[PDB]
Amino acid sequence: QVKLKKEISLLNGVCLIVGNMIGSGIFVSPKGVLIYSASFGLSLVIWAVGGLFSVFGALCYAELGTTIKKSGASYAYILEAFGGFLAFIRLWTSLLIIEPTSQAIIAITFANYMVQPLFPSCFAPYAASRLLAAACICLLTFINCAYVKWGTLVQDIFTYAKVLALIAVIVAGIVRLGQGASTHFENSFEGSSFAVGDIALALYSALFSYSGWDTLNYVTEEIKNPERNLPLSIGISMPIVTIIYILTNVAYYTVLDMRDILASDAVAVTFADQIFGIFNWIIPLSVALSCFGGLNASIVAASRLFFVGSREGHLPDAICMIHVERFTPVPSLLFNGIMALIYLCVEDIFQLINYYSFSYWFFVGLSIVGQLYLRWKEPDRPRPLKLSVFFPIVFCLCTIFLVAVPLYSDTINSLIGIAIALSGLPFYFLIIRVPEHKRPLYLRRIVGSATRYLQVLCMSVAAE
């Protein structure tokens, strides 16, 4: 039977969530909390509070994933709550601006930190990083198109690599702290900025760093026991990332003072140059391996999202096809890789993250209020675990705070993002809303011929 063959264990889910949550943010820039907090102890407080507020949302997606039990991770939940229109808007904006830009940016940072010991303070060449990024994207696309177990093995290996590197940084900081100095942690909370506009921006920066706890909800139909292995893996992977994020900043503040932290391009590179005499290239190599681990999880999640969106009536049905042996969604992965390679061609794509700062948390909060509305409207659905209504309410308030910040400040880019997200409405009312045997025949014949040729090339049929 040609179906999608559920092969994801508990360890694979833990490695997926940890390898998507820990990325380049803990390595190259844990600076926003310190620049808006102006103290060490208040920065550690803001890091712990951001970890708690991300646990509160991860529990809500554990309940949503065990209740609805369909892949897509907000697309399926908005379909189950307010179906049709808003789900298509979310699918359109993630197809158009969110996932190609993030995948291209992760690939570019991988390529930039692969060549950093050759170009220490040098302004590394531009065209050599785009080629390495394209090679990285094409290699991970091939690996995920071959087998699913190959992608889970890659995720396991590079998650172990980044965790071992962060453990090395933590152990060096702890042995220098307890050894003979302990100097910066004597007069903490001095010079602290106890204002609303500073604590709010520090919490915003700390809460962007915990992003990515919803990766396993995109692949829910491929987990062995989804009523057990999804919330157990979420509850395993949350305190690991929280403890690692606190202890890495403690190790950063033990060795470095505030001035050279706030005036460095990457804090971990300065840490490695100051505490490791030789073998200071280990840390940029580890940053490159961390970005290689994150790109694989992003590719798998985006391909499964586009698969489900194709199956639900949007996004024409070639993207729903499955390979007849080696049961992998090949044309979905091909479409995702093509879009990421197209977005690599645009110089200064780091501007483009300012356009979906508003939309991402808007759709997370929309899925949380959909969970609340389904708790009110359908109270007799089979829920294998239901929590209190405390967590969805406090995460609804947290997401309202998360979307209020890019609307007040940085207000021109948010309206551009809303225009980008609303730019798919000519496709919804003129193609999707109208049924078949009323659409133009010359479009249908062309799409059918292209689907048949792509089906013969990729050896892929729809699910039986």
Place this chain on the structure above:
Amino acid sequence: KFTGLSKEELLKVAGSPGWVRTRWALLLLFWLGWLGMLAGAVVIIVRAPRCRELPAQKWWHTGALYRIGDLQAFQGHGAGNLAGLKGRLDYLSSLKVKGLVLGPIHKNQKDDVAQTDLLQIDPNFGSKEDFDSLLQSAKKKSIRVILDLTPNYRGENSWFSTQVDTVATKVKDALEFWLQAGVDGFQVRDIENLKDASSFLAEWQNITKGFSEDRLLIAGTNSSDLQQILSLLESNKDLLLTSSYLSDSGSTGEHTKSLVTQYLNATGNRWCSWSLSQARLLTSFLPAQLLRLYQLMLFTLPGTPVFSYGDEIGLDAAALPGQPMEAPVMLWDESSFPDIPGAVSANMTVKGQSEDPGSLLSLFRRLSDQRSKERSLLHGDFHAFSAGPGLFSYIRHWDQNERFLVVLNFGDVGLSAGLQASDLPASASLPAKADLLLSTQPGREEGSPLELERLKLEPHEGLLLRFPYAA
């Protein structure tokens, strides 16, 4: 209708020779394209040239020093101790100064040579342990402490004119004692009154460098002629030496350009210090309309800028009634000078100048932030080029970082600049348009890129244009 193939008809049509060859051809073409783009990246990487190695700088290569010669005038009445100095290090860290030159604190009576001891503190400054408290308290805020060890600092002749050997023995013991106690450097002043100057300076520099290599020795002279300054720096070349070399004149700007380029040519672009005196304020030598220009110059020249206390607010010892002009009082607030009450206004004080964004303290704070972080202002290369009649223009550039252009107008007339460069290195050639960081006079706002061909200057104005690495 228009649905796709099922598994059986796909397995029967996608097995013909003609589709199999297409799939294998596309697979091999994809893999050779992947290897081709990897080879292109490897070829492009090994043809990007190189970048040179940093120069491993000392702590006095990274910003300005600050001389506090009289201690009781720096605070005021009663609180002129070494204990009261501990409460000023947050003001000193507002300036971002990297070192501090504490004046002579030891017991000197007068010309009696056998009674003065350089190891034991005069009790009018404190005792031995609050000096230690001060050293640790300054070490926490990243400020180094240099100790002045001039023997006869109460008296007209500064080096005990009768004997020469025993005072050299005094300084030789004092260097060791205070280096073990933990100071980060020394300063000896008035070395033109010391016979056999170049011999004792080499010995003291040896002892100080032999303890550690992050130690410093500063020498001061009242000379202004280049040949004596060069004569003291033949065997010694790691020595910072402060002099009256730039305090002569500069009524015309090409004269100051000649002085700076002649010094840097005559010493071979070694590390130097830039100041106007060995102990005196900038308002001992310049009118008040040139202080911003000289403060822009002293921060963007390749060396260590050295200032006395009160140079950052523009303190004048002749702006008020009677007073020793060798040691005026610092004007912290408006009750800093108790005598002749009401004579100090608000824009003459530290407190009243911190709010005005067009004050002199604000220019000092912006310039000393840019000096301690930009790599082309930390160890960049200096190059001056010719300009109009009465200008002084130069550029500082390191490798591939942001480059700085400084244009200064030492003239009482309007100038259009006309930067006739034409001789710069290819790594630092001038663009057509450059940004702005600041100006000394109001009328402009910064960040707006200005074109460098109709560049016009109002009198006594300096600019801090900036531009990135390109071709």
